[PDB]
Design a protein around this nucleic acid. Structure first.
Lengths: 119, 53, 101, 92, 124, 73
RNA sequence: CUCAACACGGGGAAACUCACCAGGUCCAGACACAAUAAGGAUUGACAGAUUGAGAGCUCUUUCUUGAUUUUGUGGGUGGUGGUG
């Protein structure tokens, strides 16, 4: 059982990316209101073309990218993406509850502290 | 090569620069002056900015 | 005759007041109603740079000033004498514009 | 510079036509304001002329100042024109 | 000797260089002929295998309003007749490179030193 | 900064050198003396019957254009 | 780096600034000499691979370009590189 804001997960995939934004938060609504010439087709063509590689078995091939500033839409559900942290691409499988989030939220850009305790 | 100078420069310190030395630090753009802090101080007299009080 | 207006703007007091004096002197050489020089408030243009290049030292500040003095005289004259009086009193440092109506 | 030959012709003729070029120190400046060619071409064509002579350059306040010398006016004739034509302000 | 002994083709070609009408090299000229802006072709005495011989005048002897050709001797000395090779500091020429097709599109030119070439073609 | 490591595979690789083939301008020649078009001309009004359309695999591509003239056949 | 460093470098850096890090292009290497080279010095590119990438980067392919380039030898130029 999973729904985003009242619409079911099987209603998510059978729904265009325009109708998803119409119930998104204000940042997501604003970005794609002025999202003309954002060049979204180069990355998204490589995602559906990678889903045809795996017929029924395990997760598709990773599609590595630099666009950390790209909002996750329901058409991305099930794909795996390597998100550039600044030096390295990190594969992260797009879970259905990742909607409305930026890709940079899932690839940390720093190794945190480990203050002392060399061990 | 169509990516050579493609990043936009329309606001912020990357677009504007000094008209005497082309620096981005310490710019004075009051009354459309567009001269750095250090360059303006050397030729404030020629522009007509004197120091009274 | 026609209603005219002459506006004077400069950064030099001594070079501006005598130009307006020549304007009014030519105005009652051949008499016509003056609406004489109405001095606008002087504008002080302040630029406050720090003092230096690099920030070493006591944080000392300078201020530089340019002073803009502005004067307008509202005359009326026949069309002939307008051009000559607008062309004789031309002096460096003083910017003169003449509004037709 | 690659600088295709129909753009040397625009640059060299205009230097013959007036004798001066100023041209705005800014590379990749996208169609220089006087000549119909790129501003990078104008700056780099006359650097080639200067190193061999033929023109003297002055730089001030992010602007160049190109002056055609007497060894360059004679050379630029057979490049573009016929004789008995005066490039510079020598024409009275 | 007296006036000229086939000496007039240079001043035909010198006035063709200065008005950018001379398409030296085959590939500009062979593509100039196929679209009909060639007015004179002067190719070669001899090449290897006769590979480009019938290709050039095949485009010239086509029976639509144009048969231009004369002939020329060995192409190594045609380089001076083209723009190839500078003065090279009071030498004969520079290190001249090859030749063997030069074609004029337009002369931008004038009287007898050019004119008597066309009577050599319009008449025999 | 002391030196460079170049962790990228050791690529001082450069472009193709505008690949130098032999003489190539050939329509075809029959005996005495005619010539007919092969690698046919373009439909561009600004290509005045002087350009050769390369046929790679099910493509016709012009080089007078910077990028793209596709009269595919 | 005491007064005479520490809301100071007008230093409120999301990109740009930017000098730092992981990576990709380009020459913007003038001129002179020598070589290649009009049987083409060289330049650019559709689609695919490839790539963060609609960078012809590089490769597959075969068109275009034409003497400005390329290669080598000297230099030239640039540097928020060093030395206050």
């Amino acid at each position: 059982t999973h729904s985003y804001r009242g619409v079911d997960l099987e209603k998510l995939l059978e729904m265009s990316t325009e109708d998803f934004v119409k119930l998104a938060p204000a940042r997501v609504r604003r970005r794609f209101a002025r999202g003309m010439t954002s060049k979204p087709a180069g990355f998204m063509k490589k995602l559906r073309a990678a889903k045809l590689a795996a017929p029924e078995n395990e997760k598709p091939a990773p599609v590595r990218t630099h666009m950390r500033n790209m909002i996750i839409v329901p058409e991305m559900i099930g794909s795996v993406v390597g998100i550039y942290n600044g030096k390295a691409f990190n594969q992260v499988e797009i879970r259905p509850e990742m909607l409305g989030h930026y890709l940079g939220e899932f690839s940390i850009t720093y190794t945190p502290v480990r203050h002392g305790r060399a061990g | 090569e169509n990516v050579w100078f493609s990043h936009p420069r329309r606001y912020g310190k990357g677009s504007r620069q000094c008209r005497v030395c082309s620096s981005h630090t310490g710019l004075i753009r009051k009354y459309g002056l567009n001269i750095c802090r250090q360059c303006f101080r050397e030729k404030a007299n020629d522009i007509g900015f004197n120091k009274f009080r | 005759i026609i209603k005219i207006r002459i506006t004077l703007t400069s950064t030099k007091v001594k070079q501006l007041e005598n130009v307006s004096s020549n304007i009014v002197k030519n105005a009652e050489q051949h008499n016509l109603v003056k609406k004489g020089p109405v001095r606008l408030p002087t504008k002080v243009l302040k630029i406050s740079t720090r003092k230096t290049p690099n920030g070493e030292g006591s944080k000392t500040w300078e201020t530089y000033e340019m002073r803009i003095h502005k004067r307008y005289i509202d005359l009326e004259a026949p069309v002939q004498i307008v051009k000559r009086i607008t062309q004789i009193t031309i002096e460096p440092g003083v910017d003169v514009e003449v509004v037709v109506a | 510079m690659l600088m295709p030959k129909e753009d040397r012709n625009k640059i060299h003729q205009y230097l013959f036509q007036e004798g001066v070029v100023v041209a705005k120190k800014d590379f990749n400046q996208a169609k220089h304001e006087e000549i119909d060619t790129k501003n990078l071409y104008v700056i780099k064509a006359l650097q080639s002329l200067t190193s061999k002579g033929y023109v003297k350059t002055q730089f001030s306040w992010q602007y160049y100042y190109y002056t055609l010398t007497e060894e360059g006016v004679e050379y630029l004739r057979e490049y573009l024109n016929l004789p008995e034509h005066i490039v510079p302000g020598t024409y009275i | 000797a007296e006036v000229t002994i086939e000496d007039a083709l240079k001043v035909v070609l010198r006035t063709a260089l200065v008005h950018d009408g001379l398409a030296r090299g085959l590939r500009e000229s062979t593509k100039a002929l196929t679209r009909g802006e060639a007015l004179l072709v002067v190719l070669v005495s001899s090449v290897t295998e006769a590979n480009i011989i019938k290709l050039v005048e095949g485009l010239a002897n086509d029976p639509e309003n144009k048969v231009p050709l004369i002939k020329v001797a060995d192409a190594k000395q045609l380089g001076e007749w083209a723009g190839l090779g500078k003065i090279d500091r009071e030498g004969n020429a520079r290190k001249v490179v090859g030749a063997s097709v030069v074609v004029v599109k337009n002369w931008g030119a004038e009287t007898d030193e050019l004119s008597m070439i066309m009577e050599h073609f319009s008449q025999q | 900064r002391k030196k460079k490591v170049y962790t990228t595979p050791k690529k001082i690789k450069h472009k193709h050198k505008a690949v130098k083939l032999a003489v190539l301008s050939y329509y075809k020649v029959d005996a005495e003396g005619k010539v007919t078009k092969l690698r046919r001309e373009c439909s561009n009004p600004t290509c005045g019957a002087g350009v050769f359309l390369a046929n790679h695999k099910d493509r016709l591509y012009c080089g007078k254009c910077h990028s793209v003239y596709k009269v595919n056949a």
